[PDB]
Curated annotation (Swiss-Prot), chain A:
One of its GO terms (biological process) is mRNA splicing, via spliceosome. Present with 721 molecules/cell in log phase SD medium. The gene is SNT309. The keyword Cell cycle does not apply. Keywords: mRNA processing, mRNA splicing, Nucleus, Spliceosome. It is found in: Nucleus. GO terms for cellular component: Prp19 complex; U2-type catalytic step 1 spliceosome. Belongs to the NTC complex (or PRP19-associated complex), composed of at least CEF1, CLF1, ISY1, NTC20, SNT309, SYF1, SYF2, and PRP19. Involved in pre-mRNA splicing by stabilizing the NTC (or PRP19-associated complex). As a component of the NTC complex, associates to the spliceosome to mediate conformational rearrangement or to stabilize the structure of the spliceosome after U4 snRNA dissociation, which leads to spliceosome maturation. The keyword Nucleus applies. This is Pre-mRNA-splicing factor SNT309.
Curated annotation (Swiss-Prot), chain B:
Residues 64-121 are annotated as: Interaction with CEF1. Residues 1-63 form the U-box domain. Probable ubiquitin-protein ligase involved in pre-mRNA splicing. Acts as a central component of the NTC complex (or PRP19-associated complex) that associates to the spliceosome to mediate conformational rearrangement or to stabilize the structure of the spliceosome after U4 snRNA dissociation, which leads to spliceosome maturation. It is also probably involved in DNA repair. Residues 55-129 are annotated as: Required for self-association. The chain holds residues 1 to 142 of 503 of the full protein. It is found in: Nucleus. Present with 11700 molecules/cell in log phase SD medium. It comes from Saccharomyces cerevisiae (strain ATCC 204508 / S288c). This is Pre-mRNA-processing factor 19.
From Swiss-Prot, chain D:
The gene is CEF1. Belongs to the NTC complex (or PRP19-associated complex), composed of at least CEF1, CLF1, ISY1, NTC20, SNT309, SYF1, SYF2, and PRP19. The chain holds residues 542 to 587 of 590 of the full protein. Involved in pre-mRNA splicing and cell cycle control. Required for the binding of the NTC complex (or PRP19-associated complex) components to the spliceosome to mediate conformational rearrangement or to stabilize the structure of the spliceosome after U4 snRNA dissociation, which leads to spliceosome maturation. Its absence leads to an arrest of the cell cycle, possibly due to the inefficient splicing of TUB1. Present with 784 molecules/cell in log phase SD medium. This is Pre-mRNA-splicing factor CEF1. It comes from the Eukaryota. It is found in: Cytoplasm; Nucleus. Belongs to the CEF1 family. It comes from Saccharomyces cerevisiae (strain ATCC 204508 / S288c).
Amino acid sequence: MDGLSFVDIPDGYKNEIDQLVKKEFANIKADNSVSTLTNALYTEYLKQRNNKKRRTPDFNDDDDTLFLEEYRRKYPRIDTSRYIPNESSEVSLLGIVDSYLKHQEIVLDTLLPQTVSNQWRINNDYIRQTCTIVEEMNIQQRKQINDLEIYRKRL
Amino acid sequence: MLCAISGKVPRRPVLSPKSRTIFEKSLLEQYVKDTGNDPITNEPLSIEEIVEISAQQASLTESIPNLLTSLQNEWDAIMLENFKLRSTLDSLTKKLSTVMYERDAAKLVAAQLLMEKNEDSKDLPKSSQ
Amino acid sequence: LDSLTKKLSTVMYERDAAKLVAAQLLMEKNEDSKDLPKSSQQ
Amino acid sequence: STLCHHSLPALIEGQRKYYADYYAYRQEIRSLEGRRKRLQAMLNSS
């Protein structure tokens, strides 16, 4: 488990260790009908065609275009009424929503900092641990080398 | 400011008293009827336990399109996202299996090397004699 | 999706962390060989 | 959540790292502790 990150390591060692890990891997080796049509639409990459009729039409048609004509009138009156209540308020309704979006944005970046601080704070605690033990390992190795030659010089 | 189920910006937000989390009324009311518990914390929660707590969208200048173009895009965007999200979930489970296998492969290396190193060190201690 | 990503992230980090154990271990094992070999020779 | 996890698994591995080397050191001290005595007994024969 133990491998000191702050205290310790070349790219060659990653490439080396990867090969040894690789060799040990060589050894081991809820919705209704809605979901059916939605998954089929996405898989096939084709959206279902809508009513491309109101836009084109034609004068001196028949009973069919008499309907299609009368459709264009009522929707154009609804359109012209739908543009009236927008222009009445105008830009006030738009800029009121623009302000809401600024309150929504700043909240996210506050959380970006809160995460930033606690993430650096955890790493900060690790750092001290790494330096604590790395010294202790240094102490151990020095003592190790002392015996190694001490035992020889006795013999 | 958002709902904690769909990822909406709620029109009638309601907060649960067991876990302080704001949901849109329709979506929290649906969960309680499906299974009577809080979705996040899995704690007992009912419809009466909820506590109810304005948003402006400027309808575009070119607002026919609402029936044809806008509605079409909404069910395209719902369709191709969840399909792509199902694709993302499938790969995470596959990449999970490659992670755990490579992990266990490393465990065996360490275990194999733990026997190797200390016995090599032991042999140096014995050599002196 | 995200709950599996936590497992993915914790693994990949811990994998390459555990990978560095080997790099260290291998070089020490290697050091033990030449040391003993050059000593046992003489 | 990574650095959170990395903290918890690392903090336990260190004691095990040290304790191994600690016991590794104890054995090394014994060889040191005896090798002297044989040298010390060279003066007894003299």
